[PDB]
């Protein structure tokens, strides 16, 4: 064994010695259990950085562990391909997003390689082959056929100067990010996923995930949105109809989930858009104004909670089918047209909106909910006026004195009696709209007949291949203006025709790729029965809190739907769920001569700060110029913030990395990166490596100690008391916690015991064996390479077939104690007890002793002194 660690040196070895044991490529082998961990995998968007690797590494522990403990690992890893990064660079370095793409690829993978993740790269997928997105090329014209797709109009912003379309996040003010130019609302056909169809499904079976994290789960359950609610029409009054036609002629129509409020309502809300809206907007130009405004604003959720919200009275006026009031219509920018019926009521009194939105316009408030006791000034809103739990009606008429859920049976009741409402169930959730105008996506499958319609393209044809040999500018997608591609013949008539050239979201690539893990060259569906069977669904999870609602709500509902069409027998692709925290990391600018400033990486600058750590000096690498020094920020490109793992692996090695990252937090805090806690790790991994190396200079390996410890010295049975200890605190950390950080702590607390401990006899020398043996052992899923040397030095099985260390119980107890028996303050007396017994058995222990129980005659304790570990005293 050389005396020195070298990571340079032993980390490449260690990584072909697990790649020629093709330890991580792994079968369907039933005879060993399953285990598949998965971390979200990345989009090649050119480096990973210590971010991305903290979640790798994080899987890899994980993954490791399990191997160890005899599981049939698979951990999987794939490039999240397509979407808008490559297009941008394609716009900037005039480079195909094709061969950006796979460049990027092939220089992660190396850096991924270099960390010595335990992957299965025989099942590594990229995500913008035909080979992948052929399959939910499939899976999209199987569910067109059922509906579960459907094209319909929608809204999208379209850029005049430009000309192309824009998302909402790049439309500021109005304008165009990149124009400036006034967007204009443009209605097109798109493609949607009926996902509301699975509104129920996906909201209930939550509650199945006892092992995600309750805040990931409340998160969905808010996005989806479900209420329980009540349908209420109110009559249009008879001099309210002019202008209008129909069931709006008739009554207004509105959804509320306060029911047990409807005697409390004072006034009425329509949309812009709504019927009662335009009629009275016919003779009256503020209302014309008032609606103008609305329809020129946005809609999004974002701007509507912090949006002043705004009304104007209409004249018309309905009547409340409950307490026969007539109530004024108002038009108000809060009410939105295609939710629910686009109409409301309004209580003042019992929801925040509505009071300040009287308290605005002076509209009336009218109590019709006491809780309690408690005071309700028409004029201050309290917490306690929307309160539906425990509040009871006022001024209701026969609902008085009726709790929520009783008045709310009660006015279903009445008002079906009187054909006025009935109870209804609504969503927040939308329709999940596929179609994106950009160019690097997979190709919607659809062919446009002039005869047929929209016809979907027959499975023999899959994939509609996306032509590679395509540099985007912007000026709009490529693909509608390539003929070779758009032009076809009809799969249903023959005659001439023309593709989709509109492609999908990728979230649809990321919806499904954990199953075709489990078979990615599986050639006659998107995954094969058999490793369908076998994988059954993901164990474990990793991944960012930025994907808990869209990314996983999509792969949820996929896993339905492919469990509908008979792909998957499971209702839930992932039964655990660990969000990693944030690696941040402090930022570095310079300010451009263009306005501007640019952002400078970490590893091109120069810190020196005073004595007192007082930052006196900051230059670029390149110039020795100063550079601004700014706050400490989320990693990533943005910033330029992003330390190349590459760069640490060369310095320090890849343990080195993948050990500061485990140990400096727990895995879902936050991580700052610290040049100081790099140099800590790699100062444990020499700490470890001399520690092995001058156990072995000392004599050399030996059988490491098992079996029955008596007659062993005190403080080797402390050590094998430790180190069994440690053994199931890192067993649990690693398992059950899944907190690293304080597993790798618990080893170095062993180490620091062995260091304190004479190891030199013989059975000395046996314990040193067990306890190095564990370590190594127990360490190996964090710094697997230095664990795989220091192993193979030690003992001369495969690692891997020793497997995790085991608890020895025997070690875990302690002599016990004898003690002494008094009665009276008298020696009657001595017991033997437990060194964990309480002082209730040591009571009990006195108490049934022989020469205790005879010097007692007969008569009762009127005390009981217990000196744990000395006496016990009986008077
Ligand atoms: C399933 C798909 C929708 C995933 C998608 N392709 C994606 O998120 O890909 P992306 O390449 O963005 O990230 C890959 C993983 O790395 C994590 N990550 C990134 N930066 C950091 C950081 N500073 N600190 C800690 N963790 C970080 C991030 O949360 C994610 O789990
Ligand atoms: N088109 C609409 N635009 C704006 N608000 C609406 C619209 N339709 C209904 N509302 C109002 O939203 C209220 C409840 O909102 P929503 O349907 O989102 O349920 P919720 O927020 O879960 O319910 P709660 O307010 O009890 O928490 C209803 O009482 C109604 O007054
Ligand atoms: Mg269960
Ligand atoms: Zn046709």
Same mark, same amino acid.
């Given at each position: 064994?050389?005396?020195?660690?070298?990571?340079?040196?032993?980390?490449?070895?260690?990584?072909?010695?697990?790649?020629?044991?093709?330890?991580?490529?792994?079968?369907?082998?039933?005879?060993?259990?399953?285990?598949?961990?998965?971390?979200?995998?990345?989009?090649?968007?050119?480096?990973?950085?210590?971010?991305?690797?903290?979640?790798?590494?994080?899987?890899?522990?994980?993954?490791?562990?399990?191997?160890?403990?005899?599981?049939?690992?698979?951990?999987?890893?794939?490039?999240?391909?397509?979407?808008?990064?490559?297009?941008?660079?394609?716009?900037?370095?005039?480079?195909?997003?094709?061969?950006?793409?796979?460049?990027?690829?092939?220089?992660?993978?190396?850096?991924?390689?270099?960390?010595?993740?335990?992957?299965?790269?025989?099942?590594?997928?990229?995500?913008?082959?035909?080979?992948?997105?052929?399959?939910?090329?499939?899976?999209?014209?199987?569910?067109?056929?059922?509906?579960?797709?459907?094209?319909?109009?929608?809204?999208?912003?379209?850029?005049?100067?430009?000309?192309?379309?824009?998302?909402?996040?790049?439309?500021?003010?109005?304008?165009?990010?990149?124009?400036?130019?006034?967007?204009?609302?443009?209605?097109?056909?798109?493609?949607?996923?009926?996902?509301?169809?699975?509104?129920?499904?996906?909201?209930?079976?939550?509650?199945?995930?006892?092992?995600?994290?309750?805040?990931?789960?409340?998160?969905?359950?808010?996005?989806?949105?479900?209420?329980?609610?009540?349908?209420?029409?109110?009559?249009?009054?008879?001099?309210?109809?002019?202008?209008?036609?129909?069931?709006?002629?008739?009554?207004?129509?509105?959804?509320?989930?306060?029911?047990?409020?409807?005697?409390?309502?004072?006034?009425?809300?329509?949309?812009?858009?709504?019927?009662?809206?335009?009629?009275?907007?016919?003779?009256?130009?503020?209302?014309?104004?008032?609606?103008?405004?609305?329809?020129?604003?946005?809609?999004?959720?974002?701007?509507?909670?912090?949006?002043?919200?705004?009304?104007?009275?209409?004249?018309?006026?309905?009547?409340?089918?409950?307490?026969?009031?007539?109530?004024?219509?108002?038009?108000?920018?809060?009410?939105?047209?295609?939710?629910?019926?686009?109409?409301?009521?309004?209580?003042?009194?019992? /929801?925040?909106? @509505? $009071?300040?939105? %009287?308290?605005?316009?002076?509209?009336? &408030?009218? !109590?019709?909910?006491?809780? #309690?006791?408690?005071?309700?000034?028409?004029?201050?809103?309290?917490?306690?006026?929307?309160?539906?739990?425990?509040?009871?009606?006022?001024?209701?008429?026969?609902? /008085?004195?009726? @709790? $929520?859920?009783? %008045?709310?049976?009660?006015?279903?009741? &009445?008002? !079906?009696?009187?054909?006025? #409402?009935?109870?209804?169930?609504?969503?927040?959730?939308?329709?999940?709209?596929?179609?994106?105008?950009?160019?690097?996506?997979?190709?919607?499958?659809?062919?446009?007949?002039?005869?047929?319609?929209?016809?979907?393209?027959?499975?023999?044809?899959?994939?509609?291949?996306?032509?590679?040999?395509?540099?985007?500018?912007?000026?709009?997608?490529?693909?509608?203006?390539?003929?070779?591609?758009?032009?076809?013949?009809?799969?249903?008539?023959?005659?001439?025709?023309?593709?989709?050239?509109?492609?999908?979201?990728?979230?649809?690539?990321?919806?499904?790729?954990?199953?075709?893990?489990?078979?990615?060259?599986?050639?006659?569906?998107?995954?094969?029965?058999?490793?369908?069977?076998?994988?059954?669904?993901?164990?474990?999870?990793?991944?960012?809190?930025?994907?808990?609602?869209?990314?996983?709500?999509?792969?949820?509902?996929?896993?339905?739907?492919?469990?509908?069409?008979?792909?998957?027998?499971?209702?839930?692709?992932?039964?655990?769920?660990?969000?990693?925290?944030?690696?941040?990391?402090?930022?570095?600018?310079?300010?451009?001569?263009?306005?501007?400033?640019?952002?400078?990486?970490?590893?091109?600058?120069?810190?020196?700060?005073?004595?007192?750590?007082?930052?006196?000096?900051?230059?670029?690498?390149?110039?020795?110029?100063?550079?601004?020094?700014?706050?400490?920020?989320?990693?990533?490109?943005?910033?330029?913030?992003?330390?190349?793992?590459?760069?640490?692996?060369?310095?320090?090695?890849?343990?080195?990395?993948?050990?500061?990252?485990?140990?400096?937090?727990?895995?879902?805090?936050?991580?700052?990166?610290?040049?100081?806690?790099?140099?800590?790790?790699?100062?444990?991994?020499?700490?470890?490596?001399?520690?092995?190396?001058?156990?072995?200079?000392?004599?050399?390996?030996?059988?490491?100690?098992?079996?029955?410890?008596?007659?062993?010295?005190?403080?080797?049975?402390?050590?094998?008391?430790?180190?069994?200890?440690?053994?199931?605190?890192?067993?649990?950390?690693?398992?059950?916690?899944?907190?690293?950080?304080?597993?790798?702590?618990?080893?170095?607390?062993?180490?620091?015991?062995?260091?304190?401990?004479?190891?030199?006899?013989?059975?000395?020398?046996?314990?040193?064996?067990?306890?190095?043996?564990?370590?190594?052992?127990?360490?190996?899923?964090?710094?697997?390479?230095?664990?795989?040397?220091?192993?193979?030095?030690?003992?001369?099985?495969?690692?891997?077939?020793?497997?995790?260390?085991?608890?020895?119980?025997?070690?875990?107890?302690?002599?016990?104690?004898?003690?002494?028996?008094?009665?009276?303050?008298?020696?009657?007396?001595?017991?033997?007890?437990?060194?964990?017994?309480?002082?209730?058995?040591?009571?009990?222990?006195?108490?049934?002793?022989?020469?205790?129980?005879?010097?007692?005659?007969?008569?009762?304790?009127?005390?009981?002194?217990?000196?744990?570990?000395?006496?016990?005293?009986?008077?």
């Amino acid at each position: 064994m050389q005396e020195h660690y070298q990571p340079a040196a032993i980390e490449p070895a260690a990584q072909k010695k697990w790649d020629d044991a093709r330890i991580s490529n792994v079968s369907e082998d039933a005879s060993k259990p399953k285990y598949y961990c998965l971390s979200m995998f990345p989009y090649p968007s050119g480096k990973l950085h210590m971010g991305h690797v903290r979640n790798y590494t994080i899987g890899d522990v994980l993954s490791r562990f399990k191997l160890l403990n005899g599981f049939n690992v698979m951990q999987p890893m794939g490039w999240d391909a397509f979407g808008m990064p490559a297009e941008n660079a394609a716009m900037k370095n005039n480079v195909a997003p094709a061969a950006w793409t796979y460049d990027n690829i092939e220089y992660m993978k190396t850096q991924l390689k270099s960390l010595g993740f335990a992957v299965d790269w025989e099942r590594e997928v990229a995500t913008c082959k035909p080979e992948y997105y052929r399959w939910e090329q499939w899976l999209f014209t199987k569910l067109f056929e059922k509906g579960i797709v459907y094209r319909k109009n929608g809204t999208v912003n379209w850029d005049p100067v430009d000309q192309t379309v824009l998302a909402n996040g790049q439309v500021i003010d109005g304008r165009g990010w990149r124009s400036g130019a006034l967007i204009e609302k443009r209605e097109i056909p798109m493609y949607y996923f009926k996902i509301t169809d699975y509104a129920e499904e996906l909201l209930n079976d939550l509650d199945k995930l006892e092992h995600w994290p309750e805040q990931v789960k409340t998160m969905q359950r808010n996005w989806i949105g479900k209420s329980r609610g009540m349908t209420v029409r109110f009559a249009v009054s008879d001099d309210s109809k002019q202008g209008l036609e129909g069931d709006y002629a008739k009554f207004l129509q509105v959804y509320t989930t306060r029911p047990d409020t409807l005697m409390g309502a004072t006034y009425v809300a329509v949309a812009a858009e709504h019927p009662l809206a335009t009629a009275a907007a016919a003779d009256k130009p503020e209302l014309q104004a008032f609606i103008a405004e609305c329809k020129a604003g946005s809609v999004a959720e974002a701007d509507m909670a912090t949006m002043e919200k705004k009304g104007v009275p209409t004249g018309r006026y309905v009547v409340n089918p409950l307490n026969g009031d007539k109530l004024e219509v108002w038009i108000a920018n809060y009410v939105l047209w295609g939710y629910g019926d686009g109409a409301v009521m309004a209580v003042p009194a019992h /929801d925040e909106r @509505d $009071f300040e939105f %009287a308290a605005k316009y002076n509209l009336p &408030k009218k !109590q019709v909910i006491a809780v #309690g006791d408690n005071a309700f000034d028409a004029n201050r809103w309290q917490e306690w006026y929307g309160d539906k739990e425990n509040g009871v009606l006022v001024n209701s008429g026969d609902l /008085d004195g009726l @709790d $929520f859920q009783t %008045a709310f049976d009660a006015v279903a009741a &009445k008002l !079906q009696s009187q054909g006025a #409402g009935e109870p209804k169930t609504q969503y927040r959730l939308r329709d999940w709209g596929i179609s994106r105008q950009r160019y690097w996506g997979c190709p919607i499958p659809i062919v446009h007949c002039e005869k047929c319609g929209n016809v979907p393209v027959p499975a023999d044809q899959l994939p509609v291949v996306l032509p590679e040999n395509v540099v985007p500018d912007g000026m709009g997608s490529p693909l509608a203006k390539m003929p070779e591609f758009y032009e076809t013949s009809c799969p249903c008539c023959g005659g001439a025709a023309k593709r989709e050239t509109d492609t999908m979201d990728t979230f649809i690539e990321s919806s499904w790729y954990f199953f075709r893990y489990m078979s990615p060259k599986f050639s006659d569906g998107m995954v094969s029965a058999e490793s369908a069977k076998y994988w059954g669904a993901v164990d474990q999870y990793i991944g960012g809190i930025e994907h808990a609602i869209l990314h996983l709500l999509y792969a949820r509902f996929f896993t339905k739907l492919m469990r509908d069409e008979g792909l998957v027998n499971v209702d839930e692709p992932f039964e655990r769920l660990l969000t990693q925290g944030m690696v941040v990391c402090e930022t570095y600018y310079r300010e451009n001569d263009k306005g501007g400033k640019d952002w400078i990486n970490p590893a091109d600058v120069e810190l020196t700060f005073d004595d007192k750590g007082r930052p006196v000096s900051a230059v670029l690498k390149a110039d020795g110029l100063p550079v601004v020094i700014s706050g400490t920020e989320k990693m990533s490109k943005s910033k330029n913030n992003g330390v190349d793992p590459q760069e640490l692996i060369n310095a320090y090695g890849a343990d080195t990395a993948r050990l500061f990252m485990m140990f400096a937090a727990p895995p879902e805090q936050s991580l700052e990166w610290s040049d100081s806690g790099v140099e800590g790790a790699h100062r444990f991994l020499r700490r470890l490596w001399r520690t092995v190396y001058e156990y072995l200079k000392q004599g050399g390996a030996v059988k490491a100690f098992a079996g029955n410890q008596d007659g062993l010295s005190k403080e080797l049975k402390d050590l094998r008391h430790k180190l069994h200890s440690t053994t199931a605190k890192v067993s649990d950390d690693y398992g059950r916690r899944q907190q690293f950080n304080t597993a790798i702590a618990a080893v170095m607390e062993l180490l620091n015991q062995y260091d304190k401990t004479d190891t030199g006899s013989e059975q000395g020398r046996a314990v040193a064996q067990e306890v190095l043996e564990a370590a190594v052992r127990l360490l190996w899923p964090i710094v697997p390479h230095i664990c795989e040397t220091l192993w193979s030095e030690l003992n001369g099985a495969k690692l891997w077939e020793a497997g995790w260390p085991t608890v020895d119980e025997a070690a875990l107890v302690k002599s016990e104690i004898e003690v002494m028996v008094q009665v009276n303050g008298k020696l009657r007396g001595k017991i033997t007890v437990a060194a964990d017994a309480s002082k209730a058995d040591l009571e009990a222990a006195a108490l049934a002793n022989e020469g205790a129980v005879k010097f007692m005659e007969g008569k009762p304790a009127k005390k009981i002194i217990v000196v744990p570990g000395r006496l016990v005293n009986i008077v």
